[PDB]
Curated annotation (Swiss-Prot):
This is UPF0284 protein MJ1598. GO terms for molecular function: nicotinate-nucleotide-dimethylbenzimidazole phosphoribosyltransferase activity. It comes from the Archaea. It comes from Methanocaldococcus jannaschii (strain ATCC 43067 / DSM 2661 / JAL-1 / JCM 10045 / NBRC 100440) (Methanococcus jannaschii). Belongs to the UPF0284 family. CDD domains: DMB-PRT_CobT.
Length: 346
């Protein structure tokens, strides 16, 4: 309808009428401060993830005082997530797995240290701990459904690395936030780091993460496995990075994906990315529902939204996913667009 479904195997009936909790897991990547692997400008990259979740939780950013707009002038996808949170009354609580600058709203601290130098094969020490920290947290979170999103700048390069390190064919398939994608750079950083950590076929998932992952990933894997083991549906609210994460879920608990309980929820912009292949990556991982939200941003009064139609900003902060949740639960898609148009004064 206003949802694009790839292997909807009675999953949409599973998220209908259920009570959600939304959470966004934020992290920073040390590489990102010296190497322009991400589209977020260096001058503001440290502050970006907190500012995102502040907008979702509180209604405005508090470290950054400026409005939801990126280079290109596009409203950042937190505007979508917020819209949904306000129009569908979705309780939300956000998690820090290493943001350079911490949020000024209440947040769950899980790891205060950033993800490390990806090109040096030292992303982290404790992918297993982070996984467990996320698992145990999930037990104490009560909801009939989890929508778990992310906000990690440079996360598109760690998604590439982790998938490549688990032996998937991902090369032209993981993409970028922007239209421009410095692929040559990104893949050199990732391969450089797999080389240095000594990653191979015999490597464990915790090694690959430790080499080139980002800390958001284990936590979300823990969170998701936890809800899935309790027979609760989970929407991995992100694009191509969530495929990486799905890949990790498969390594830790292959038999959880046999339950039809974990879906990727993203936007039409990611799905229909000319420069990437979410569907393709996910076919290699397993038969998992992939669902994208339609925004009808072509009709938007605010021109920054139409930039989504071009690829200039595609997804983030669980926007794709929380909108899937909303739309299936009877939010008219245009209500999202209008919300954002009305809200643009703060």
């Amino acid at each position: 309808m206003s949802i694009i479904a790839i292997n909807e195997n009675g999953f949409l009936d599973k998220i209908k009428g259920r009570n959600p909790l939304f959470t966004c897991v934020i992290s920073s990547i040390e590489t990102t401060l010296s190497i322009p692997i991400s589209g977020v400008h260096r001058d503001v990259i440290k502050y970006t993830p907190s500012a995102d979740v502040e907008l979702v939780f509180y209604g405005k950013s508090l470290t950054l005082k400026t409005p939801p707009i990126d280079a290109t002038g596009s409203p950042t996808p937190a505007t979508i997530t917020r819209a949904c949170v306000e129009l569908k009354n979705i309780k939300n609580l956000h998690i820090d797995a290493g943001a350079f600058v911490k949020p000024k709203i209440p947040f769950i601290e899980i790891d205060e240290k950033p993800t490390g130098r990806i090109e040096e094969g030292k992303a982290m020490n404790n992918s297993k701990e982070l996984y467990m920290k996320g698992y145990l947290l999930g037990k104490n979170l009560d909801a009939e459904l989890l929508i778990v999103g992310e906000s990690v700048p440079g996360g598109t390069t760690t998604a590439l690395g982790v998938l490549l390190g688990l032996g998937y064919d991902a090369e032209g398939k993981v993409s970028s936030g922007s239209i421009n994608n410095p692929h040559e750079l990104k893949i050199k950083v990732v391969r450089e780091g797999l080389k240095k950590a000594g990653i191979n076929e015999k490597s464990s998932v915790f090694d690959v993460l430790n080499a080139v992952g980002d800390k958001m990933m284990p936590v979300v894997a823990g969170l998701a496995i936890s809800f899935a083991e309790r027979n609760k549906p989970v929407i991995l609210a992100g694009g191509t990075q969530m495929s990486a994460v799905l890949a990790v879920i498969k390594e830790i608990n292959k038999k959880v994906l046999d339950k039809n309980l974990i879906a990727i929820g993203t936007t039409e912009f990611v799905l229909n990315d000319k420069k990437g292949d979410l569907k393709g990556i996910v076919e290699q991982i397993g038969n998992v529902p992939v669902l994208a939200s339609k925004f009808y941003f072509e009709k938007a009064k605010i021109e920054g939204l139409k930039n989504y139609c071009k690829g200039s900003v595609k997804e983030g902060v669980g926007a794709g996913g929380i909108a899937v949740y909303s739309i299936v639960n009877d939010l008219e898609p245009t209500k999202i667009r209008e919300f954002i148009e009305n809200k643009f004064y703060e």
